[PDB]
Design a protein around this nucleic acid. Structure first.
Length: 1125
DNA sequence: CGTGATTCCAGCGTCTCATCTTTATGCG
DNA sequence: TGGAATCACG
RNA sequence: CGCAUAAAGAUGAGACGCGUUUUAGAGCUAGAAAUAGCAAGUUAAAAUAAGGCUAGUCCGUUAUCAACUUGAAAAAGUGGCACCGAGUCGGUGCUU
């Protein structure tokens, strides 16, 4: 026996393999064709390739899951709301909540009256004429004092709870008929009364247009600055204006504050940053800040609410009512216009649902835009359309109320209207007086993103911790869930664990200990030369200890520029020392130390080392959390040793980022005979210049033994490391997993012998790739705890072979057949083994008709079907959306996805007079029906009208099951009613070489003589252009069997048979979408298209052979299905 | 009533909080 | 790119 | 492998606006019909994978998968070799 080297190819859609010996030949062997066929053996060369569908990223599933959760919780909102007054709706009419549920149903499926709001036509019709939209009811309820109808209250409230707005504005709002202009003038006056040196003036500034245009907020700010008389963008009044339109200014440069003091209006931190300013600068600007807040509120409220109504405290509902009135008038006008003039267009606009006009726009499913692309022609051709052309130019003509731009409404004004309804109907409905807060909470309560799914343990996504087993409602959430541990989990479950101690976690990025560690390790490298010494020397440990106290504990920043003059010549008085190292920069500095020095009362609480346990817990909470409620709750257990002012100072700070080392690694483990930690050794460098980067593997310390031992203690599973891999960026790790599978398989098809010089191929991921090969094998140990190097693993930078393919002309015309994956793998092996090591062998491996191509079978999973809910039809293709929703009435989905097909031989009644007959048929199991089938297949097939099913004769047929019929014709099973081309065209290499040069694949390249030779090669061999068509035609006739398309292609080929060769090649290379493996795909040849010839028949394969193939396709179970019937 | 062609179709768009990774250069 | 429908006929 | 800076992918969570579907929002007129004339149109309820039991304000579209023996599963196990060729793999021989 002889060694072997595998050439492998990672990828996102396929993985190639090959097996090469000491010389580049590819061995050959027979192989056992197990199964019931006269063909016992089939010779195969080891070179093949495994095509597969690309692994999908979990984004689509996550989106679906979040949507499902949101629908569940919206239904709960409505249920929460219905049971809040389920006992008073019973008084008026009990079936009211009943009718709404079955409002979807048809007359013969309902069990109540067919009117959902009132239960009677007259009452029903009066509703849609008094309230042509919900917003007339929303408008009415805000502005009314007469007794409403509890079902009409539910209607409005349910309307807002169901569609409640966005939560991006933190805080609260109140429209209360506020006007922008007066607020701006009031701000100007407030600034002027304390800035008489240079007061602001309104001359030349539009107080309303500038800050309400469609321009971006910063652009509007700078435009306002420009329109002002002489103000600068960074002035105090400029900052106030910027706040007044939502920008985030900082005031240290204006009020000479002790801190930067940002005012982040768009975040909840504003509510206390304003208080901080009221502490730092005081009341001198309180009214100015409040005016700026009011201006920000008004500007943001108007930016989305285009109207400026005053008579009503319901700006949104009144807005949409106005949009309804304008749409009605606009339509009434446009109707007369297109019938006083242009009288031939009426039926197409107001009746035809197939055209994007009004008929389409309203009833048929056209959008606003497609209609606006349609009605403008007809508006351009008639007088009196000026008002209509104006609106179309602004997207304001004939507008809907429920639209794609309605997403800018905050939940705050929905909430305002909900309080208005609540605040005006309580006296008439007393139960409503003591339910005010409960409903508002239903509208306003969002689960925090750091609590996550509210599971009790059956959820792989959840982390919430419960103080009690009670059910979580809006009103007991604050007390059932322990928000603090919930948030700490939210961060910690995602925070890494320290590699040196794989079982436990890293510390914050600004830990006090980590803060020292990062700097103690840096200044170790400082060098100096002075009198008396005979050669350069570093700093000593005691010198570092002394330096820390009077350089790093003292100032916010440290540089050798200070040290080389302030320390040596003055602290220990070196005469003429010369200092070496980095010229100026010290990267690490005790940033947290000076922050605390500024924040907390005493420096002694930082110079002291006994307070270490506290500071680490303080910084830990300032990094884990970001809510003020949570930080306030957590710090307070430790503020009792500080003054309340110090506690308030700490509460503001936030850190970000997590470290890569653990507290125990730095200060937990101690040498078993030296009794010192890594931190201690960083204080005790000594003469050896020892530091962490060598302490972790210096055998004179036990730290090496501990770290190595821990990396073993944390193990326990092997096959799951292939899914950690690159922590996150692809979902193509499918490639890695399949790759190992073909190395595994190839071993047990090479005599369980391991390879030598395994050459991977495609710096980003390949580092992870190679070692998992080195980990899954090459594992035997040695006496000194050393792994023996039994297999060598290579990796290349994805490009070296692609230059070898030109340097030696082994051209790669991609579009012909998939043999290039295996051929690239084989050249990968060639180059890899050459780099570490006859020429002709390549010429054989590059013209071998046989290449083990396997399309990995697959059991389809995912969406049950296409997601569009199509209208009601009289077909059996439609799928009920519920157990009681017959599709013929209700519509449903269609075009399912079949997980896999099953072969069934069974009896079925047949004939005009029913009698039994034997049959053989492919069923096709949908993704829905897979669970029922795998529960018990006999009953499942038996309910489908089949009788007398034989279990042992049932066969599972995943997608891409490969059959073979006459003349080596093969077909792949694309969902039980469609085959799919199953053969490859071995268009020999002589026609590959000509076509690559001829079509000049990239654009055009080559040196003068090289270009001359290559172009003349195409000129001389013009008759390959006549033989290529012969290969395509004969192969199509033998396997593709597309008579019409082959006729078309030949006819077109002759019809355009006179263009220059380059143009001829560039289009014939598109003729290989005929002979390619896989789904048929239409192509064009010189602006004449040969469409796609589908197959749409699985009858042929029933009486054909079936090839179960392994991962590599070297082992077959080749069932002949004529034996079954 | 069993074959075979041509045509058409497919759910989409926002905000926010956190958390890993790799790429590119400059030092050890 | 696979399901479904509309169309021509032997 | 750690430090200094910028951008791009992956994971999770919390939320919005739509869209589709059946129904509800008594169409009138010439008629015996087809069909024609007129009027209206902008909103809502419900569902948004069937559904599952663990019965949660949870789970349900990612990953994984040839066949065969043992199987509750996990998982293990199952298919000699060489030399001369080439059209999807064929031939010859030692072996058994």
């Amino acid at each position: 026996d002889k060694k072997y080297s595998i050439g492998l190819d990672i990828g996102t859609n396929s993985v190639g393999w090959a097996v090469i010996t000491d010389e580049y030949k590819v061995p050959s062997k027979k192989f056992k064709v197990l199964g019931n066929t006269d063909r016992h053996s089939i010779k195969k060369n080891l070179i093949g390739a495994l095509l597969f569908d690309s692994g999908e990223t979990a984004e689509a599933t996550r989106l679906k899951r979040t949507a499902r959760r949101r629908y569940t919780r919206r239904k709960n909102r409505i249920c929460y709301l219905q049971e809040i007054f389920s006992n008073e709706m019973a008084k008026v009419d009990d079936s009211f909540f009943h009718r709404l549920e079955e409002s979807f149903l048809v007359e013969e499926d309902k069990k109540h009256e067919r009117h959902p709001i009132f239960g009677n036509i007259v009452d029903e019709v009066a509703y849609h004429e008094k309230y042509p939209t919900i917003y007339h009811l929303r408008k009415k309820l805000v502005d009314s004092t007469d007794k409403a109808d509890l079902r009409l209250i539910y209607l409005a409230l349910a309307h807002m709870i169901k569609f409640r707005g966005h939560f991006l504005i933190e805080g609260d709002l109140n429209p209360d008929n506020s006007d922008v202009d007066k607020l701006f003038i009031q701000l100007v006056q407030t600034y002027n009364q304390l800035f008489e040196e240079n007061p602001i003036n309104a001359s030349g500034v539009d107080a309303k247009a500038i800050l309400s245009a469609r321009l971006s907020k910063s652009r509007r700010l700078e435009n306002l600055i420009a329109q002002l008389p002489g103000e600068k963008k960074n002035g105090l009044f400029g900052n106030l204006i910027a706040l007044s339109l939502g920008l985030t200014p900082n005031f240290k440069s204006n009020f000479d504050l002790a801190e930067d003091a940002k005012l982040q209006l768009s975040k909840d931190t504003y509510d206390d940053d304003l208080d901080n300013l009221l502490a730092q600068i005081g009341d001198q600007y309180a009214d100015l800040f409040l005016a700026a807040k009011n201006l920000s509120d008004a500007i943001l409220l108007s930016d989305i609410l285009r109207v400026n109504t005053e008579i009503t405290k319901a700006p949104l509902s009144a807005s949409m009512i106005k949009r309804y009135d304008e749409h009605h008038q606009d339509l009434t006008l446009l109707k007369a216009l297109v019938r006083q003039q242009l009288p031939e267009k009426y039926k197409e606009i107001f009746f035809d649902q197939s055209k994007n006009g009004y008929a389409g726009y309203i009833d048929g499913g056209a959008s606003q835009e497609e209609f606006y692309k349609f009605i403008k022609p007809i508006l351009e051709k008639m007088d009196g359309t000026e008002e209509l052309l104006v609106k179309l130019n602004r997207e304001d003509l004939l507008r809907k109320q429920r639209t794609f731009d309605n997403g800018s409404i905050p939940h705050q004004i929905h909430l305002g209207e909900l309080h208005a309804i609540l605040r005006r109907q309580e006296d008439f409905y007393p139960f409503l007086k003591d339910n005010r807060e409960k409903i508002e909470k239903i509208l306003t309560f969002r689960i925090p993103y750091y609590v996550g799914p509210l599971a009790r343990g059956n959820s792989r996504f959840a982390w919430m911790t419960r103080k009690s087993e009670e059910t979580i409602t809006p009103w007991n959430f604050e007390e059932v869930v322990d928000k603090g541990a919930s948030a700490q989990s939210f961060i910690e479950r995602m925070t890494n664990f320290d590699k040196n101690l794989p079982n436990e976690k890293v510390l914050p990025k600004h830990s006090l200990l980590y803060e020292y560690f990062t700097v103690y390790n840096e200044l170790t490298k400082v060098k100096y030369v002075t009198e008396g010494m005979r050669k350069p020397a570093f700093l000593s440990g005691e010198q570092k200890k002394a330096i820390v106290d009077l350089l790093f504990k003292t100032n916010r920043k440290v540089t050798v520029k200070q040290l080389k003059e302030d320390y040596f010549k003055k602290i220990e008085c070196f005469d003429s020392v010369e200092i070496s190292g980095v010229e100026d920069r010290f990267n690490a500095s005790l940033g947290t130390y000076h922050d605390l020095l500024k924040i907390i009362k005493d420096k002694d609480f930082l110079d002291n080392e006994e307070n270490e346990d506290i500071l680490e817990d303080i910084v830990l909470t300032l990094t884990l959390f970001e809510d003020r409620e949570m930080i306030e709750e957590r710090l307070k257990t430790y503020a009792h040793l500080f003054d309340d002012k110090v506690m308030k100072q700490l509460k503001r700070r936030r850190y970000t980022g997590w470290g890569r080392l653990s507290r125990k690694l730095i200060n937990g483990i101690r040498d078993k005979q030296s009794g010192k930690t890594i931190l201690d050794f960083l204080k005790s460098d000594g003469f050896a210049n020892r530091n962490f980067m060598q302490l972790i593997h210096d055998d004179s310390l036990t730290f090496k033994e501990d770290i190595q031992k821990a990396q073993v203690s944390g193990q326990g599973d092997s096959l799951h490391e292939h899914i950690a891999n690159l922590a996150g960026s692809p979902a193509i790790k499918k490639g890695i997993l399949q790759t190992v599978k073909v190395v595994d398989e190839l071993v047990k098809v090479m005599g369980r012998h391991k390879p030598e010089n395994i050459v991977i191929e495609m710096r980003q991921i390949t580092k992870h790739v190679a070692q998992i090969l080195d980990s899954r094998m090459n594992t035997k140990y040695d006496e000194n705890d050393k792994l023996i190097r039994e297999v060598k693993v290579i990796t290349l930078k994805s490009k070296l072979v692609s230059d070898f393919r030109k340097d030696f002309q082994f051209y790669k015309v991609r579009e012909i057949n998939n043999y290039h994956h295996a051929h690239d793998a084989y050249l990968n092996a060639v180059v890899g083994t050459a780099l570490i090591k006859d020429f002709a062998t390549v010429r054989k491996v590059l013209s071998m008709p046989q290449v083990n191509i396997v399309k990995k079978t697959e059991v389809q999973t995912g969406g049950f079907s296409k997601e569009s809910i199509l209208p009601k039809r009289n077909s059996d293709k439609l799928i009920a959306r519920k157990k009681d929703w017959d599709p013929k009435k209700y519509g449903g989905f269609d075009s399912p996805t079949v997980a896999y097909s099953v072969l069934v031989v069974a009896k079925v009644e047949k004939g005009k007079s029913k009698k039994l007959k034997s049959v053989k048929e492919l069923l096709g199991i949908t993704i829905m029906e897979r669970s029922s089938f795998e529960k018990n297949p006999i009953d499942f097939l038996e309910a489908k009208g089949y009788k007398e099913v034989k279990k042992d004769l049932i066969i599972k047929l995943p997608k891409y099951s490969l059959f073979e019929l006459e003349n080596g014709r093969k077909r792949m099973l694309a969902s039980a009613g469609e085959l799919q081309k199953g053969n490859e065209l071995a268009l020999p290499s002589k026609y590959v070489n000509f076509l690559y040069l001829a079509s000049h694949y990239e654009k055009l390249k080559g040196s003068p003589e090289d270009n001359e030779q290559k172009q003349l090669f195409v000129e001389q061999h013009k008759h390959y252009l006549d033989e290529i068509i012969e290969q395509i035609s004969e192969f199509s006739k033998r396997v593709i069997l597309a008579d019409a398309n082959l006729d078309k292609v030949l006819s077109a080929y002759n019809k355009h048979r006179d263009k220059p060769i380059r143009e001829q090649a560039e289009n014939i290379i598109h003729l290989f979408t005929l002979t390619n493996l896989g789904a048929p795909a239409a192509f064009k040849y010189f602006d004449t298209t040969i469409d796609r010839k589908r197959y749409t028949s699985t009858k042929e394969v029933l009486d054909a052979t079936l090839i179960h193939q392994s991962i590599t396709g070297l082992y077959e179970t080749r069932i002949d299905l004529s034996q079954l019937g």
